């Protein structure tokens, strides 16, 4: 899912539904666009909210000096044996403890979850 | 950082931050903020030498003092917010070596552990065997002593 | 167990994984995967396709841990939400051994015979995850079970000896407080059901419990530090303060609502007003 | 639902029997202590359009000084009560020449049925009862005491003993639970006994306003 | 690792801490109670606990053996800067 | 009067605040009397139950005639009355003091 | 109520001399973002991240009625310290408000408008960051945030 | 300041400035709370 904007003019996208045909399409009160919406969803809601933070975690995060780093657990692309690891920082979840780990070579921004 | 350590065209009282996670570098020139110096760690190693002792032992006479000690870049100025930043060392002689590997990082060391204490709190003998009420009470006491 | 899942309020987003509104302009040529073979056995003979049926979609994800850690059914479920709304949703939800467990809602069947479709269908989302009320009592946060140690909340009976015998039962102490229908609930003790809210227990029990309770409290908000207190003094404070028939606060107001003198008022909080009004 | 609906009925009518029995009506032992077993046979079970329709459980019990003083106790069928409802209530009253009544009320009351209840006052006396309220007897809980209401007389010598006034006594509101549970009007005074730890027993007065 | 299973009514911070807390409890109380058993009759920290006339046992200990653990708020050290104490400890440092 | 302290103190904590201290005045007149509990006693059993009775009249703490004042009178001594027969007992006399 | 219920959280600011709150968009109208796609071009700068979408969408919804900059400039002088009797009166005391009273520090001459577009559309994504909990809400006692 | 006019009359009973009962005897059993001590009934717990 994601927001679309109108092409006469650069502003938002919203749904409309097509009462001629029974479809779904997309329009902008601004101007007189009408557009197909292939995205069956206009609206989804993680309510649990799921996610490993994997896609929120940057890979530069690898050149603090404050972090801590072991040997212990490799990367599994290249095999370099530094990696820093550090907690979670979503709040809504089951759990709160564990490691997320990065591979510490700068040339390897590979992350990963034991 | 190497421009800062010296002095060439920024002064030693700026501080520089770079803040990994969030993607954002903030300098201040401002006034107000509060700092204290720092030696500074390369690798393992201090590099505050046996010669810069020297010359500061035989400080008088010589016009070397703690000016040039900070213009070869041996100790720096860091304020609370670039903390956040630092790894510190209590001590050289004991958190530099191979003891078990805590961490290998530092980037800077204490002067020395009692630099912590104020004025009034810097004339109590032994203030780590005492109560911190105790060494509080000592603090305000002390300004009513006579002399 | 069983009572502690019945006295504790579960709102519908609690069992909830994610919801999803979809577009399925006609019914059986639906848009997600799994749902074609669930959707074909109710409509091959179908309940209520008889009227026109909305294009849009609402799409609730249940999370099995949550809904079997409350003992809960889907078909409880959709009988809460379809009584508790009317007949303005059509229901349809799943075998209970679809792997990933799912209630596809629909707006009113004779609306489709303002708010915009797929708005009301959000409002309503937003509507039931906070006020759905799916099982237990509100204003209750959550209820802990476990088995006193302390005497004061074991069960002391009088044996065939005549002895006093300490039995250890399992006790139940809620967040948050609603105690008239929890001394209402089935199997609960209403002799011996009590909570720390003195308002609460005056509008329920009346002013002599609150004056047996209010002492309680006291006695026990002064002997936790391991001191001593007459016990004349407590009940001293407990009679003044409920003596005029309702709960006296020590306060400017419910010192100035005794009707004295006033200047024995002024000489108390409310200096120059008092006199004024005298 | 019914099972339950079925329970709610038989706690509320063991309710209304002890309450009637507290007040000093006549009440036979076999109404006082009814299994739900035993009521479910005699009420004939399910009450949704089955045989407890809540007109089929009015109670009517005599006093046990005169049986002509008596009180009728009604279960409305409506979620809420209208002046309607309590006026084909009060012309029922008046049919019988009873003059004290109850009414259970499942939700609650219009404003306008309250003022309605308390403009009758002089001639008949209608007191409301929530639902709730019935399905627990408060009276044996631990924290609420024993309470005794006082005859004129008793009253009478209990002011000539300590040589009160009337004012000087503790007091309780007529909007007390217990004091709706003894039906206790203003002016009347109420006798508590409550056992103490420093002394055994104490006795309490409070005045009813 | 993952291992550690949440207690009933408890968060997995809250069992955390309970279980850190109950460790270095049982630790203080057992050096307490190893110095209080070794003072000799003569000592007059003992001779003043006893007879109750100013200290105590955990006093004694304090002196002796372990001054314990500190607390803020009744909760353990928190973490004034990012993620650590003080800037001479590791980020996410749990450690005593 | 031990149904009703069963009744009063449920959890059955027998630890009770009263004015006079009669184990203490028992152990007091024991010493000042110089009595020998080896021998066997010339007190009789009943002028104890006697005494009793009539020391429990003496002991007012609401002064009337009326039956009200008599049941204030017995509802404010009745704990202490409790204990006084209880420590004062015919048996615990004759074995005990 | 239903309406409510819809949409929940808005984003407001507070400005100098102004009475009352103001939605966001409008202000970034006023300073002359028209556009939809500008407005949240300077607000998100991940456009493949939903959470944020999800979070503005209900102030743009608020702010759908005004749609161009001198009606948002009328909209924002109604509410200033005094209601003019001339719109174009409320306009320039507007316009000179958002030019001298807002963000000194980021310009103060007209060429500025841009980069006060970029700093106010950073404190809209510093409060919809913390908002997601992806960042850690500023400690006052911090001694850093201190002068 | 709520409790400063409390006080036991010579009825024994405990009243108010406006001459209201609060306790018909003070502390419910009439005795001042400085010459009492702690006891034991030796009736309540035994074994019948
Ligand atoms: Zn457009
Ligand atoms: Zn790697």
Partial sequence: ?114 | ?147 | ?278 | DDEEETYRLWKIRKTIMQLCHDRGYLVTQDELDQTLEEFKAQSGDKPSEGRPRRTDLTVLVAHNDDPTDQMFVFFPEEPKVGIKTIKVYCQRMQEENITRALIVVQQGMTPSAKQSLVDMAPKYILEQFLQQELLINITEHELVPEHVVMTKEEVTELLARYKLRENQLPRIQAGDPVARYFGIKRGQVVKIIRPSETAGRYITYRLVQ | ?96 | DREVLRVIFPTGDSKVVLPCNLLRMIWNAQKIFHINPRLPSDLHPIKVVEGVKELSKKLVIVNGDDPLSRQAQENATLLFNIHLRSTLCSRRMAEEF | ?147 | ?48
């Fill in chain 1, 1 to 114: 899912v994601g927001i679309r904007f109108c092409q006469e003019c650069n502003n938002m996208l919203y749904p409309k539904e097509d009462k001629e045909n029974r479809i779904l399409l997309y329009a902008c009160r601004n101007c007189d666009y009408q557009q197909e919406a292939d995205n069956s969803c206009i609206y989804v809601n993680k309510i649990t909210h799921e996610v490993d933070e994997l896609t929120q975690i940057i890979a530069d995060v690898s050149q603090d000096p404050t972090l801590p780093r072991t040997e212990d657990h490799p990367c599994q692309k290249c095999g370099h044996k530094e990696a820093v690891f550090f907690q979670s920082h979503s709040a809504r979840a089951e759990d709160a403890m564990r490691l997320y780990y990065v591979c510490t070579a700068p040339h390897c921004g590979h992350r990963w979850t034991e």
């Fill in chain 2, 1 to 147: 950082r190497k421009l800062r350590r010296q002095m060439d065209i920024i002064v030693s009282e700026v501080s520089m931050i770079r803040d990994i996670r969030e993607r954002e570098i903030r300098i201040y020139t401002d006034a107000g903020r509060i700092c204290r110096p720092l030696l500074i760690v390369e690798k393992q190693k201090l590099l505050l030498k046996k010669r810069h002792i020297d010359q500061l032992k035989e400080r008088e006479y010589n016009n070397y003092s703690w000016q040039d000690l900070v213009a070869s870049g041996v100790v720096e100025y860091i304020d609370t917010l670039e903390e956040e930043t630092v790894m510190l060392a209590m001590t050289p002689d004991d958190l530099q070596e191979k003891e078990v590997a805590y961490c290998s990082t530092y980037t800077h060391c204490e002067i020395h552990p009692s630099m912590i204490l104020g004025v009034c709190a810097s004339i109590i003998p032994f203030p780590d065997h005492n109560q911190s009420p105790r060494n509080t009470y000592q603090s305000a006491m002390g300004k009513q002593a006579m002399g």
């Fill in chain 3, 1 to 278: 167990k069983d009572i502690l899942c019945r006295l504790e309020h579960t709102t519908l987003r609690k069992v909830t994984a994610n919801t999803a509104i979809y577009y399925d302009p006609n019914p059986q040529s639906t848009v997600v995967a799994e749902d074609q073979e669930w959707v074909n056995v109710y409509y091959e003979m179908p309940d209520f396709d008889v009227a026109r049926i909305s294009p849009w979609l609402l799409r609730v994800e249940l999370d099995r841990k949550h809904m079997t850690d409350r003992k809960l059914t889907m078909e409880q479920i959709a009988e809460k939400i379809n009584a508790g709304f009317g007949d303005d949703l059509n229901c349809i939800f799943n075998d209970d051994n679809a792997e990933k467990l799912v209630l596809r809602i629909r707006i009113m069947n004779s609306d489709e015979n303002k708010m915009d479709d797929d708005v009301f269908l959000r409002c309503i989302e937003s509507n039931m995850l906070t006020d759905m009320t799916l099982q237990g009592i509100e204003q209750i946060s959550k209820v802990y079970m476990h088995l006193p140690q302390t005497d004061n909340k074991k069960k002391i009976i009088i044996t065939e000896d005549g002895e006093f015998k300490a039995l250890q039962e399992w006790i139940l102490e809620t967040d948050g407080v609603s105690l008239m229908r929890v001394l209402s609930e089935k199997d609960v003790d209403p002799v011996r059901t009590t909570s720390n809210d003195i308002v609460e227990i005056f509008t329920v029990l009346g002013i002599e419990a609150v004056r047996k309770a209010l002492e309680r409290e006291l006695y026990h908000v002064i002997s936790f530090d391991g001191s001593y207190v007459n016990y004349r003094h407590l009940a001293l404070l407990c009679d003044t303060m409920t003596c005029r028939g309702h709960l006296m606060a020590i306060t400017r107001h419910g010192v100035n609502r005794q009707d004295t003198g006033p200047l024995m008022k002024c000489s108390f909080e409310e200096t120059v007003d008092v006199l004024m009004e005298a």
């Fill in chain 8, 1 to 48: 300041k709520s409790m400063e006019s409390v006080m036991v009359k010579y009825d024994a009973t405990v009243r108010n400035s406006i001459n209201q009962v609060v306790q018909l005897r003070y502390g419910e059993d009439g005795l001042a709370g400085e010459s009492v001590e702690f006891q034991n009934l030796a009736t309540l717990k035994p074994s019948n």
């Fill in chain 5, 1 to 96: 690792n993952n291992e550690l299973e949440p207690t009933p009514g408890n968060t997995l911070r809250q069992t955390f801490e309970n279980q850190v807390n109950r460790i270095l409890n049982d630790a203080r109380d057992k050096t307490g109670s190893s110095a209080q058993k070794s003072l000799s009759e003569y000592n007059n920290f003992k001779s003043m606990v006893v007879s109750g006339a100013k200290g105590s046992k955990i006093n004694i200990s304090q002196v002796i053996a372990v001054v314990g653990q500190q607390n803020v708020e009744g909760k353990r050290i928190p973490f004034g800067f990012k993620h650590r104490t003080l800037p001479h400890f590791i980020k996410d440092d749990y450690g005593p």
């Fill in chain 7, 1 to 147: 109520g239903a309406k409510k219920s819809a949409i929940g959280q808005r984003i407001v600011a507070t400005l100098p001399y102004i009475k009352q709150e103001v939605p966001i968009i409008i202000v970034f109208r006023a300073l002359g973002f028209v556009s939809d796609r500008d407005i949240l071009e300077h607000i998100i700068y991940d456009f493949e991240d939903p959470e944020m979408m999800e979070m503005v969408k209900p102030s743009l919804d608020e702010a759908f009625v005004i749609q161009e900059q001198n009606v948002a400039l009328n909209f924002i002088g109604s509410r200033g310290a005094k209601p003019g009797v001339t719109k174009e009166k409320r306009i320039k005391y507007a316009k000179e408000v958002l030019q001298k009273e807002m963000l000194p520090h980021v310009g103060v001459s007209d060429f500025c408008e841009t980069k006060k577009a970029y700093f106010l559309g950073y404190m809209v994504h510093r409060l919809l960051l913390a908002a997601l909990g992806r960042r850690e809400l500023d400690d006052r006692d911090h001694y850093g945030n201190k002068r």
